[PDB]
Amino acid sequence: PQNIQFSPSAKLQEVLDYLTNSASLQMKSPAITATLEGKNRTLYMQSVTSIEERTRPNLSKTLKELGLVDGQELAVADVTTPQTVLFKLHFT
Amino acid sequence: STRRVSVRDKLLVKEVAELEANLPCTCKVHFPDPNKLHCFQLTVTPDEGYYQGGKFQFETEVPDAYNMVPPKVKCLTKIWHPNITETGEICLSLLREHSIDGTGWAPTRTLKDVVWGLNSLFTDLLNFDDPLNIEAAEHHLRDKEDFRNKVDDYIKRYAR
């Protein structure tokens, strides 16, 4: 379970930015999801057209706005991950 | 808490993410609800065979115990087909629970596998031996020419 450092007021786009641009990660077209109240919520998935279009407006939303609590694990997947990798969210 | 990612979901984030990049050219995928990754529709538009040019819609739902159990798949396009019934149930062995015929479901199977399977129902996995719609196989047996006409009529009415 890897760690990421972002503030509650940080936009979802910034997370996507770290995933894409990090010299260790360099995701090509990542999916970002989280479980809230038992059910999966897709935050942003740029790999499926019908989901990418419907979830694109989430990119301007802050992590707080999306309903994410401190310490929450995000389920992310990408072409460059063999399986889903979890990320632990550290609110700075 | 109630904010922990399930077994099914962890699989599906990966499986759905890779799905569109690995579709048969003849296929397209649609998710009516972007949160419900366990729920999508598939359109197969064959480029050969009896069903060339028809469009065939499929609804698939992946159960909470996914990958130990195969996704449930229903066909939504009324069709005259030996392996797909008029009301839309499907005979795809990959969707069964493997007994002796180790050709059933297995955890090593992914959503990509299912789509390629459904796509083949119009090509290489179209079979009149041990069909699910016995009437259609009988029809094809007795009068292939009239069979094609029924198929064409159904495509023209329900799959255009």
Check if B156 contacts A (Cβ < 8 Å): no
DSSP B66-95: BTTBPPEEEE-S----SSB-TT--B--GGG
- Determine which helix (DSSP H) or strand (DSSP E) holds B18, and give its type and residue range: helix B7-19
Number of compact structural domains in chain B? 1
Asked if B4's CB is within 8 angstroms of A35's CB, the reply is: yes
Q: Where are the beta strands (DSSP E) in chain B?
A: 27-30, 39-44, 56-61, 72-75
Phi then psi dihedrals of residue B157, to 5 deg = -90, -40
Domain that residue B116 falls in: 1-160
Best CA proximity match to B70, nearest among B43, B32, B103: B103
Q: B18 to chain A: which residues are within 8 Å by CB? A: 47, 77, 79
DSSP A12-72: HHHHHHHHHH-TTT--SS-EEEEEETTEEEEEEETTSHHHHHHHGGGGGSBTTTTTPPTT-
Check if B160 contacts A (Cβ < 8 Å): no
Tell me how far CA of residue B128 lies from CA of B124, B133, B139, B148, in angstroms.
12, 9, 10, 14
The residue assigned the tokens 């399986």 is A83
Domain that residue A57 falls in: 1-92
Q: Sign of the CA dihedral A57, A61, A67, A73? A: positive
Q: How many other C-beta atoms lie within 10 A of the C-beta of residue A35?
A: 20
Q: Which of A16, A37, A41, A42 to mutate to test the interface with B (most CBs of B within 10 A)?
A: A42
Between CA B150 and CA B132 the distance in angstroms is 17
CA B154 to chain centre: 18
Q: A56: nearest CA in chain B?
A: B34
Measured in angstroms, the resolution is 2.5
CATH number of the domain to which A27 belongs: 3.10.290.20
Terminal-to-terminal C-alpha distance of chain A: 18
Q: B108 to chain A: which residues are within 8 Å by CB? A: none
Number of compact structural domains in chain A? 1
Asked if A35's CB is within 8 angstroms of B29's CB, the reply is: no
Q: How many other C-beta atoms lie within 10 A of the C-beta of residue B13?
A: 28
Q: How many other C-beta atoms lie within 10 A of the C-beta of residue A30?
A: 23
- Which residues make Cβ contacts (< 8 Å) with residue B114, sequence separation at least 6? B60, B70, B71, B73, B92, B94, B95
Q: Sign of the CA dihedral A62, A66, A70, A71? A: negative
Q: Are B30 and B115 in contact (CB under 8 A)?
A: no
CATH number of the domain to which B4 belongs: 3.10.110.10
The tokens describing B95, both together, are 């969707």
